[PDB]
Amino acid sequence: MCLKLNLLDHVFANPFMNAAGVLCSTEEDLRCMTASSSGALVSKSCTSAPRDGNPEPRYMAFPLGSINSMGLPNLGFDFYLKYASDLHDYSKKPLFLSISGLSVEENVAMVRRLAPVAQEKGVLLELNLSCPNVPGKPQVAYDFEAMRTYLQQVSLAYGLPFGVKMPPYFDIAHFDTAAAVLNEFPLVKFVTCVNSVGNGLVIDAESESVVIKPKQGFGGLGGKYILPTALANVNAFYRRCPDKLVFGCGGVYSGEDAFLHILAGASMVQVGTALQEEGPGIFTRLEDELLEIMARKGYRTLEEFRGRVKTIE
Amino acid sequence: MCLKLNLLDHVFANPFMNAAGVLCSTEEDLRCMTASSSGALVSKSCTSAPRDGNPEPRYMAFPLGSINSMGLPNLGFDFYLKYASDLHDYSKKPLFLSISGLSVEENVAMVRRLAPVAQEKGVLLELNLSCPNVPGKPQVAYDFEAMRTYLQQVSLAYGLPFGVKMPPYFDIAHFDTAAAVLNEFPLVKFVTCVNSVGNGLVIDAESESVVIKPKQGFGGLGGKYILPTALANVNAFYRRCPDKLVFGCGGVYSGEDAFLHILAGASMVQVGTALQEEGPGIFTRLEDELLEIMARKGYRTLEEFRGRVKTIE
Ligand SMILES: Cc1cc2nc3c(=O)[nH]c(=O)nc-3n(C[C@H](O)[C@H](O)[C@H](O)COP(=O)(O)O)c2cc1C
Ligand SMILES: Cc1cc2nc3c(=O)[nH]c(=O)nc-3n(C[C@H](O)[C@H](O)[C@H](O)COP(=O)(O)O)c2cc1C
Ligand SMILES: *C(/C=C/c1cccs1)=C1C(=O)NC(=O)NC1=O
Ligand SMILES: *C(/C=C/c1cccs1)=C1C(=O)NC(=O)NC1=O
């Protein structure tokens, strides 16, 4: 019985990794994620220049999930590039690098610089088109024209295999259009579904107040709230992008939740809110719990059930 | 002391009502909602002609909420119009009628016939622009040019105050744009936020199967999953639509959840999933719970706290 995978020219001990933004901002965070049982890690989305992000409180967690408006905060591209070039131990596990420039120009600027590092070291790009917390800069992937431009320019500037972090969609016509944009770009080898469900609002009944400070309390939702949305987007792109990989993200707290993502079509399974709450010990739990489900069902590998969710009649 | 209110030139005993589609399809259902302690009721969304709706199973509920792909099912407009014109006892509470034609022409045809009964009896139109479960017919309010065309034509054809059942949005630019489209129409006097969170996917781990039959298992989400999304939309439209009322729908299981909706800006509060699961006895519980929270905080009216959610700094 076995959780191993072999994809994008890398070997993964298991399908689990952090979700971008969780436990991956500093060198310390990145070492911790490397020392953990995860199959891979991804760095914090970065802009070209370092940034502070939004005023605190900007993240809060509850029994059913999390709300966040982290905004810009990252140590900057130079730092994440050096991590990938000089510091990351690739013998431990594969590394993905998330970028989220504020203009197509900014992204292209960065991906020009990442390419030689990608060629040399094997770092994998994840391009973030779905941040819901920068004011005056809505989720790029909700503007399909903008999306096609970003992907053109980045494919052209980078010229190597990469993936895209997508926002959730809620409408069958949007699934159809978005997968079709993506399928114009053969260098898009993976699609990560989903980023936070944007612009929710948590209100505390006792205080009568919002619980995060930026944007009058509005922020992206993670965790239990979003699992059926995440599974929908995972399967919707799995069905519509038969030449690409789908990475699942959203609502994973258990090996059962990972099992569902995998049934829906996920290759790698990312863990945001639950990892933020539980810490990196979650990875050993998720592995054991997923193996227990596989054992009970007689499944010996991931590809025996990946994408094999059953429909009714 | 008592939760009574006036809106839209009617009087309501409390802000609670069913959500359209729940406990409101048949004459029996409507009689049962009329007999309950809700402050109002809304009929099931209807098409000009009767329809059966989708294959069963089409609704399933879980601890965290519900998924549904009910699709077309209603007794047809003639039935709901006759309920409004001849059977409803307006002495007990107000009635809303929900319409959901498949084209602008169908909606125009219905509202032309509803207009006289609205003039005579005061039945209130809730126009549904957000059904996530007709194949080929995506949520009208996710296409802003289509939404403007529907609201121009209905306003011209109806000529009396009405409301719109909105889908959730997730993007501040979308809130800005949708609210500005609504604000182009002075006859749109209330905005119901939200319809179900469209096209989620529930998967049963043991059976490895989706749980509803239509649309390969995809359906709209209700219940605990959607409360922060609902609150966000309620507040977003409450802030942007100062000359309209906002009706709250989504995730209400308790008087506390109702309190949050009303803090966010809700005038009426609609109950879907929770009502489907608990039945109409829920209304006495919701009233009792809301009165109790109000007491504990020293609020005597709903006006004292509606829209008074606090932000940080
Ligand atoms: C504190 C926080 C920071 C995040 N930062 C990023 C980020 O920098 N880039 C990104 O693509 N997504 C970011 N996200 C989104 C997550 O990667 C993930 O898509 C979302 O939380 C849903 O997964 P979950 O349900 O496991 O939390 C962040 C989420 C949280 C909670
Ligand atoms: C079985 C079912 C049928 C529904 N039918 C309708 C409908 O005919 N028209 C409509 O506007 N919304 C319909 N909805 C959406 C609800 O009115 C409501 O917007 C949604 O369920 C979210 O509220 P909740 O969280 O309380 O369930 C339906 C919901 C359910 C669960
Ligand atoms: C926004 C992206 C933020 C970045 C900060 C520096 C570079 S990119 C977020 C996102 O993608 N997902 C979230 O849930 N929260 C965010 O703030
Ligand atoms: C669809 C609207 C369905 C109609 C059937 C006859 C007339 S209109 C739904 C909706 O608006 N919200 C839901 O959650 N489910 C539906 O099926």
| B221 contacts on A by Cβ (under 8 Å) | 228-229
Same domain membership, residue A60 and residue A6: no
- Give the Å distance between the CA of B72 and the centre of ligand 4: 6
- Looking at the fold, whether A172 and A284 belong to one and the same domain comes out as yes
Residues of chain A positioned with their CB less than 8 A from the CB of B205: 256, 259-260, 293
- Check whether residue B96 and residue B202 sit in a common domain: no
Separation between Cα atoms, residue A279 and residue A22, nearest integer Å: 10
CA B133-A168-B196 angle, to 5 degrees, is: 35
Q: Which atom of ligand 1 is nearest to the CA of A195?
A: 19
Instruction: Decide whether any atom of ligand 2 lies within 6 Å of the B74 Cβ.
Output: no
Check pocket membership of B46 for ligand 4, CB cut-off 6 A. yes
A166 lines ligand 1 (CB under 6 A): no
Method for structure elucidation? X-ray
Ligand 3 centroid, distance to A74 Cα (angstroms): 9
Contact in structure between A98 and A45 (CB atoms under 8 Å): yes
Angle, vertex CA B303, rays to CA B298 and CA B304, nearest 5: 35
In the block, residue with structure tokens 């005038």: B267
Give how far the C-alpha of residue A230 lies from the chain's centroid of Cα atoms, to the nearest Å. 11
Closest-CA residue to B200 (of B22, B44, B27, B64)? B64
- Residue B211 sits in a domain whose CATH number is 2.30.26.10
Residue B223 Cα to ligand 1 midpoint, Å, equals: 23
Same domain membership, residue B156 and residue B64: no
Mutation site, A229, A237, A238, A261, interface B, largest B CB count within 10 A: A229
Task: Note the ligand closest to the C-alpha atom of B107.
Answer: 4
For the record, the structure tokens of A146 come out as 């903008």
Question: Amino acid identity of B165?
Answer: K
Q: Is A298 annotated as a binding residue?
A: no
Residue length of chain B: 313
Q: What token pair was written down for A24?
A: 């991956």
**Position A19, amino acid:** A
Output the residue whose Cα is nearest ligand 1's atom 11. Answer: A20
Give the rounded distance of the alpha carbon of A291 from its chain centre.
23
- Give yes or no: residues B234 and B307 share one domain: yes
A 157-216 residues inside an 8 A Cβ radius of B: 167-175, 197-203, 205, 207-210, 212-213, 215-216
Which of A175, A205, A229 is the closest to B256 by Cβ? A205
Q: Which residues contact A57 (CB under 8 A, 6 or more apart)?
A: A211, A212, A213, B312
C-alpha span between A300 and A312 (Å, rounded): 25
Q: Nearest chain A Cα to B307, which residue?
A: A208
Q: Which of B132, B208, B310 sits opposite A263 (nearest CB)?
A: B208
Query: Do B125 and B153 lie in a common domain?
Result: yes
DSSP tally for chain A: helices H, then strands E: 9, 16
- The finding on whether B251 has its CB within 6 A of some atom of ligand 4 is no
Number of domains comprising chain A = 2
**What gap in Å lies between CA B216 and CA B67, rounded to an integer?**
13
- In this complex, do A224 and B64 lie within 8 Å of one another by their Cβ atoms? yes
Which candidate, B247, B287, B289, B249, places its Cα nearest to that of B265?
Answer: B247
With an 8 Å Cβ cutoff, are B175 and A199 in contact?
A: yes
- Cα of B201 vs centre of ligand 2, distance in Å, is 16
Cβ within 8 Å of B, A 291-310: 293, 305, 308-310
Q: How many residues does chain A have?
A: 313
CB atoms within 10 A of CB B52: 9
- Kindly state whether residues A90 and A67 are assigned to the same domain: no
Distances in Å between the alpha carbon of A239 and those of B156, B221, B257?
A: 43, 21, 37
A199 annotated to bind ligand: no
Q: Which of B138, B208, B235 sits opposite A171 (nearest CB)?
A: B138
The two beta strands, B162-166 and B124-128, are parallel
CA-CA distance, B106 to B104, in Å (whole number)? 6
Is B98 in the same domain as B203?
A: no
Instruction: Tell me: do A203 and A292 sit in the same domain.
Output: no
As a 3-state breakdown, chain A gives helix, strand, coil percent values, each rounded to 5, of 40, 20, 40
Q: Ligand 1: distance of its center to the CA of A143 in Å?
A: 20
DSSP secondary structure, B130-163, as one string: --S-STT---GGGSHHHHHHHHHHHHHHH-S-EE
User: Rounded CA gap, A17 and A124, in Å?
Assistant: 13
Pocket test for ligand 1, best of A59, A195, A254 (most atoms within 8 A of CB): A195
Specify the CATH number for the domain of residue B264.
3.20.20.70
A248 and A258 in one domain?
Answer: yes
B217 and B104 both lie in a single domain = no
**Ligand closest to the CA atom of residue A272:** 1
Q: Which residue's alpha carbon is at the smallest distance from atom 14 of ligand 4?
A: B196
By Cβ distance, the residue of B198, B256, B311 closest to A171 is B198
Dist. CA A210–CA A228, nearest whole Å:
25
A270 burial (CB, 10 Å; 0-12 / 13-18 / 19+) is buried
Q: Which atom of ligand 2 is nearest to the CA of B224?
A: 25
Q: How does strand A218-222 pair with strand A65-68? A: antiparallel
Q: Exposed (0-12), middle (13-18) or buried (19+): which is A136, by Cβ within 10 Å?
A: exposed
A311 reaches B (C-beta below 8 A): yes
SS3 A221: strand
Based on the fold, state whether residues B85 and B201 are members of the same structural domain. Answer: no
Minimum-distance ligand to the CA of B76?
4
The neighbouring-strand residues paired with B197 are B221
Residue A42, ligand 1, Cβ within 6 A: no
- B132 in reach of chain A (CB within 8 A): yes
Segments forming the whole domain that contains residue B218: 54-71+197-222
d(CA B193, CA B233) in angstroms, rounded, equals 6
Cα(A271) to centroid(ligand 1), Å:
9
Q: Which of B52, B195, B246, B283 to mutate to test the pocket of ligand 2 (most atoms within 8 A of CB)?
A: B195
